[PDB]
Amino acid sequence: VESGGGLVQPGGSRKLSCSASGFAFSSFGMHWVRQAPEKGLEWVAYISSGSGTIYYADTVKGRFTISRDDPKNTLFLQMTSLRSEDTAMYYCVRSIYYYGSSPFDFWGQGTTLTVSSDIVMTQATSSVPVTPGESVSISCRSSKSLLHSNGNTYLYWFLQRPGQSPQLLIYRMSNLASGVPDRFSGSGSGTAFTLTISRLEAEDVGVYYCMQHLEYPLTFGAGTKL
Amino acid sequence: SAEDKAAVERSKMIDRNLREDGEKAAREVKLLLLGAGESGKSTIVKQMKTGIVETHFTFKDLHFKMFDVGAQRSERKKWIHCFEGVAAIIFCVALSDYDLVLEMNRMHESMKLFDSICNNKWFTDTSIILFLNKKDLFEEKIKKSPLTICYQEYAGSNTYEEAAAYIQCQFEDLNKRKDTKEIYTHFTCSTDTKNVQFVFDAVTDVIIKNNLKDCGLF
Amino acid sequence: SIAQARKLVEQLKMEANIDRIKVSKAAADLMAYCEAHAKEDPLLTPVPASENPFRE
Amino acid sequence: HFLEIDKKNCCVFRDDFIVKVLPPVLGLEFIFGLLGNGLALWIFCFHLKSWKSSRIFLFNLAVADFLLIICLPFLMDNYVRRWDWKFGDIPCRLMLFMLAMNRQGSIIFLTVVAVDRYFRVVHPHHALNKISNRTAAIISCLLWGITIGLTVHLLKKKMPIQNGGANLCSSFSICHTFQWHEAMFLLEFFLPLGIILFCSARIIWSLRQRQMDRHAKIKRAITFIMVVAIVFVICFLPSVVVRIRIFWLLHTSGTQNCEVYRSVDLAFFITLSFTYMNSMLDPVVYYFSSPS
Amino acid sequence: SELDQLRQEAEQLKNQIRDARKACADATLSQITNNIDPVGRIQMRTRRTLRGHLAKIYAMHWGTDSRLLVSASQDGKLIIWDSYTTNKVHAIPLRSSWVMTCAYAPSGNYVACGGLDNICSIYNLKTREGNVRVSRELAGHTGYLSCCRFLDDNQIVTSSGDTTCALWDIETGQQTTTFTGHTGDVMSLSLAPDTRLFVSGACDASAKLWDVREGMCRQTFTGHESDINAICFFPNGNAFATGSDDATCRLFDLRADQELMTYSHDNIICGITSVSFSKSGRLLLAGYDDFNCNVWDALKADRAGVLAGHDNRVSCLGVTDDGMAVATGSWDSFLKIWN
Ligand SMILES: CC(C)(Cc1nc(-c2ccc(O)cn2)no1)C(=O)NC1=C(C(=O)O)CCCC1
Ligand SMILES: *[C@@H]1O[C@H](CO)[C@@H](O)[C@H](O)[C@H]1NC(C)=O
């Protein structure tokens, strides 16, 4: 579990914090994905394991600062100049990278804050009928074929149930995550992808987002509500 | 390759931890402790302070690792090559079991194991430290019993000075490699000290010879 | 002492009362297996370097 | 006789005895030196598997000796023609630099070896005995820097001296000015002597205070500690002792009569030939005599 | 005097087996495979070298994916490598640095190790709470652990130096079955492809085929003159190869109940530390004490290649399930991938 951060500020600066709990925080790379009040999620920052490589979003490159303290298991986010666009619920995401790992597996609770080239993921569809028991398929597309030479396509599927943080369903477009029922399945051709649900349930309702991990300025797809 | 680049830097973080542990492990002296079970290794271990037993002690800013393999009771030659590379071998022999039998007396049983260990193909240059324990019991036992029971060819007075030096000379005679390895013999009492100093002196001579191997002189 | 010899004898009887075939029958099985999978052994028959996961 | 060299009265001689004794003495040192250091350098690179910090320091000594040896036949040509240099200004400038740099470099990479062996016997548990190969390389490069930085002025001093009808390539001329690089010539011997003699005595004393000399290989290594302390004195004391005699004559007799320097000047270049003896005997004392 | 009578019956019963074994020996393996063409000279190059171990490597095992492998060393580390990119996936520090065996679970979520501590430890690779942690410590053996092989996700089989082999249940940590009958220390074991039988080589120069379900010995094979150090099952599952200390190898057939071929040379006087078959079973790779791993053409018993790339004893050997690579560890603390 993880949470923490501030809530309200006029202009100036504010600092966000996260409290890792019982998952060996020192060997995990952490992100700071944020989500606008009514739009989709948007990546913000990233810090590697051991505080090595650090990446920032193009729109927050100079104003924001991400740092971690492996003792006490705390992740920080320092923001200096906070404009009006920077009004979003900031989530804390863990991810570990080895041969067969599943990045973006756990997402934090998240806190809200108000002030008072790249690859574009289309995801043209926005809303579909909510009739249960059918076989709903969600389509998505990418600007360029995200199939690397090693043979894996870096497309991730996230489900955001209404009222909670996003949950990873499928990583690398074919592999199912831990704890996810076998109903969800994913197939793609490198450029166009689909996510298949065999039998809809009461807990499958929500907005389904897509992410890419080929080039690091990674973007989402605005979701597809049910 | 974004995930591949993150995997490579994780391997690099593993590499630096392996080297950090290797530096610490290279600074510890590894000793192998042997005997005949009741030869007195238990009391020797306390002086320094199933499966394998590791003993940790330090002396003069030097950290020693002592391994006891007395609970194996298996084919020695199938696991004795794992200890090739120890600084020295600490051998414990009781001096009061020359007349006691396990048939065959216990003293010659130690001689059989000492002969195999000393002349082992793996231990051709490792210093062997021989500890003759239970010298206090051997003091009184030689008064009431002679040494002819153990060594029928012994011809000397049944005094501690003459009898004990005969047993030590007999043990060192089994050393065939008299020019590649050195055997250190010391006399141990039940309540004594400076035993760890004797081990410390012996390993320094091994270290000095090892240093003169890197420089090429020796 | 007597039981240990009896147990060894009892086990030896079970091994003796076993079904066996001629060596030529058993030698043909090993020979036939190797030729049946000769084309699927990269060490025996090297695959093109493009298919090597280790060359590149 | 007499020569005016850079606003100081320096007396320069041309003895006929030099022509018949130095060319063959220097010839023997070169011919065996190339076979000695050249072979030793080959073993260090292509015939060695693992490199330790101790072997790195020995490697620099082989390189320093090798560079000094290849400068011998230029000296032989100068000696055959009786101090008559016809190779130019820069080659005269370059050859002198490669003599003072390689001689002092070799002396530097044997006081390092003597100190290196001192720490391996008298302080066997010291952290210096386990320095990584990278740390040795930094020290070797640093020691090479001091050697080059102490002889850079040989590349600034215009040294195509014209002596009558002859041109001389030599910075060792007798005259009455306190020239630094002449007291440094004595420093190359006295300071390493105070280190090698102290280290060699302590190494042997420790191997005897502990009853460790009864070994066959240990006792062999003890003798070769004395060999390097005797070869160093043999190859460097004769050249030094002559130079103090020159200093003694300068203070008492002076430059006003350059006739009492007729014999000593000839003797100095005789003893300076023994300096190149060390660069030839080193491979058979440091590398070829090691059991490894 | 029933002891003498039992011994006389045992000698007569043993002679019956030898007579029965000789009766079925219609021909020799060399005669049957005389017409086949030799594989020719086989050359393998070191496609990769895995560095990071700072002590002698005593065991290794491949994953079922033919991409990941685990190796053991006396520095106390269990390293999981990515054989494609040399990357280190994991590095597990062991409680006891004296480890003599490795195992990788066919599922891939567990690894096992053991040694002079007489304990087989199971590690959980796929732990949701961060890193790799120990799962079960299986105790009950008296001698050192020589080998261990994962039967399944919950069943493992171990061979020890107390002349016994045991089958464990990881969930409870208790010995389901104990296999006895060896007189010397068991040095290796190998499960069948069907995972219903397994063989074991012992220091008494004998190989015994066990039944995992029932728990009793079925066959006993002899012919070696010294301790058997390695064993491996043929890909078919009806044969196995043994590597002993007398610098020889032998091929035994389960149905024929006798040795078929002998792999030895007069120039080799060094023992064998590990053996392994190729995917087709045509090649038999053996690691020797002369720092060289030898490739034997099993059908014709003729040498076909040498893997000379190590500077010390080749302790462990492995062939991928895909058959596209051979990993060779040694005491010089280096692992090499060949071809
Ligand atoms: C150039 C040199 C070496 C004199 C010199 N030494 C230094 C110096 C400087 C700094 C330092 O740390 C040490 N030495 N500068 O000049 C010299 O006269 N060489 C000659 C001979 C020789 O030696 O072979 C014999 C024939 C004549 C020429
Ligand atoms: C050289 O000798 C003359 C005559 O003795 C003397 O006047 C002059 O000072 C000397 N040169 C130097 C540099 O002292």
Author numbering:
A (entry chain S): 5 to 120, 136 to 245
B (entry chain A): 6 to 54, 182 to 234, 239 to 354
C (entry chain C): 8 to 63
D (entry chain R): 9 to 300
E (entry chain B): 2 to 340
From the primary publication:
The hydroxycarboxylic acid receptor (HCA) family consists of the typical metabolism-sensing receptors present in humans and belongs to the class A GPCRs. Here, we present cryo-EM structures of human HCA2-Gi and HCA3-Gi signaling complexes binding with multiple compounds bound. Agonists were revealed to form a salt bridge with arginine, which is conserved in the HCA family, to activate these receptors.
MK6892 is an HCA2-selective agonist with a chemical structure that differs from the 3 preceding compounds. All agonists, except for MK6892, had a very similar binding pose at the orthosteric site. The carboxylic acid of MK6892 occupied a common position with the other 3 agonists, and the hydroxypyridine side was extended to TM4 and TM5 to form additional interactions. The hydroxypyridine of MK6892 and Q1123.37 forms a hydrogen bond and the oxadiazole of MK6892 forms a van der Waals interaction with H1895.39. These additional interactions explain the high affinity (EC50 4 ~ 20 nM) of MK6892. Mutational analysis showed that Q112A decreased the potency of only MK6892. Rotamers of H1895.39 in the MK6892-bound structure were conformationally altered to fit the ligand compared with the other agonists. In these structures, except for the MK6892-bound structure, S179 and H189 form hydrogen bonds, but no hydrogen bond was observed in the MK6892-bound structure and may be rather unnecessary. Considering the extended ligand-binding pocket in the MK6892-bound structure, we hypothesize that the gap between TM4 and TM5 and ECL2 is the entrance to the ligand pocket. The MK6892-bound structure, however, shows that the ligand-binding sites in GPCRs are highly flexible.
